[PDB]
Amino acid sequence: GEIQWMRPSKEVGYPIINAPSKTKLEPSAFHYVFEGVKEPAVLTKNDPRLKTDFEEAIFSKYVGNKITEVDEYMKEAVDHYAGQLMSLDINTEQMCLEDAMYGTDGLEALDLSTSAGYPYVAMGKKKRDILNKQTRDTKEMQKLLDTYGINLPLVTYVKDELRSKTKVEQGKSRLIEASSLNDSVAMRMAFGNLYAAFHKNPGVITGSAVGCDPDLFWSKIPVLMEEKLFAFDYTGYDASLSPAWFEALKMVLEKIGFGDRVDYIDYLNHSHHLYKNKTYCVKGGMPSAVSGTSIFNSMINNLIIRTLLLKTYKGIDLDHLKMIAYGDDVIASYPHEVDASLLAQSGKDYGLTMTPADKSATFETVTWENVTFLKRFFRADEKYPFLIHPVMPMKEIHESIRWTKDPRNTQDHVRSLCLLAWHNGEEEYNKFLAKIRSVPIGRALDLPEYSTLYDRWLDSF
Ligand code: NA
């Protein structure tokens, strides 16, 4: 990805956009009951904590575009991936406006809380004024589509979340690149069935895990993997994507029956952005908050890994490449050991910056003992080995519980954490519950005991 140009929005016919400048995050009732070193990310150029130019920092993710066209290895990757997907017998029909708006089997309704994007954000019109979850009205939406059309600029906000002291000091805040309600609706109508098919088929066929439920899915994953696992981390995945990778994606879509609407992918590739009083154009890079962001990054990941394996290990059997992606995150396998360090090398020629799995200093062998997916480990249950526990380290949960965005969501927030934590064992979970109950706020919460969560789990299969 690379920003072609940036200038005052007025100069190109656009209004100034208001992006919140004050974090809604602040110390929670457990701020001092648990350890933590994370704080709210920088949201404005004036934040006292900054140690470098903010603007420069948030846009530096666009490391440029390495490759220009789709080479021979990429084409092979496309054919193989498209071939697998073809077996899912995905419905290629467009999705009706109603379902694209309010949902259907395999596709959740549009999120009413998230932004309505441009121009609604500048007209003050919110999403709650356009759709009725119970009326399932599409009349208001239809007029809006006919009025403002599609391919609208993407509204950019800085994401309000916790970050390391380092990332805070270097202005490394992540950005929300929200598509207009019009594009989301249009794109969900164009790819709605593709999304549903993926959400319903997390595994090694779609090579995707978007829409999965870690509590149940973790027991299916091992069975799907080949003998030797391999993995690695990406540095600025989304932003590093070159235009060729988007073209590769269109070929897959074309081969599986969506050639009809590959133009929507162009909208992702060559994108239009609004930030504050500036507007900029990007060539390459996947927008962060577009309908399909997660699924398309995953499809592209499948193309990337297949390509690197073909470039590096000629004669490799992609039919025995068993991988599952979730955006840039990925867990993969092959009957034979492969060199991640080597793959990382080939990766640089494709505009991808790959590093050791889980922040290691060197490329070590990936095993069931140390592999993580979605920041979760894999641990067979002591009583029933065939049931696999998705284990997220307590550190993350601790960091999270020390802050709050709305005292009215304390019950949910803390309950969410409990569903993640208990997998660390009864001893750990109880220590967690006791610390929570060492202050008034925690003692008033309704939290599940270990026995309850363990039984709920066994009963969910
Ligand atoms: Na782009």
Q: Which two tokens stand for residue 69?
A: 């066209």
Residue 80 C-alpha to ligand 1 middle, in angstroms? 26
CA of 64 to the centre of ligand 1 (A): 11
Tokens at 105, concatenated = 């089997």
Counted residue by residue, the chain has a size of: 461
Span from the CA of 180 to the centroid of ligand 1 (angstroms): 15
Distance CA 54, CA 81 (A): 40
Distance (angstroms) between ligand 1 centre and the Cα of 3 equals 8
Question: Among all chains, which residue has been given the structure tokens 């805040």?
Answer: 173
- Distances in Å between the Cα of 362 and the Cα atoms of 232, 290, 369, 413 are 11, 34, 17, 36
Q: Which residue positions form the known binding site?
A: 233, 328
Between the CA of 60 and the centroid of ligand 1 the distance, in Å, is 14
The alpha carbon of 65 and the centre of ligand 1 are apart by a number of angstroms equal to: 11
In CATH, what number does 213-242+292-367 get? 3.30.70.270
Burial of 50 (0-12, 13-18, 19+ CB in 10 A): middle
Which residues, other chains included, contact 244 with Cβ-Cβ below 8 Å and sequence gap of 6+?
67, 68, 69, 70, 74
For residue 348, the CA-to-ligand 1 centroid distance in Å is: 20
Going from the Cα of 303 to the center of ligand 1, the distance in angstroms, rounded, reads 18
The dotted CATH code for 375-461 is 1.20.960.20
For the purposes of burial, counting CB atoms within 10 Å of the CB of 459, is it exposed (0-12), middle (13-18) or buried (19 or more)? exposed
Q: CA 72, 75, 81, 85: dihedral to nearest 10 degrees?
A: -160
Question: 145: how many CB neighbours lie within 10 A of its CB?
Answer: 17
Name the experiment that determined this structure.
X-ray
DSSP β-bridge partners for residue 59: none
Separation of 322 CA from ligand 1 center, angstroms? 29
Is residue 271 within 8 A of residue 38, CB to CB? The reply is no
Domain ranges of the chain: 1-13+70-202+243-284, 213-242+292-367, 375-461
Cα(277) to centroid of ligand 1, in Å?
A: 19
- Annotated binding site for Mg(2+), which residues? 233, 328
Q: How many whole angstroms from 286 Cα to the centroid of ligand 1?
A: 5
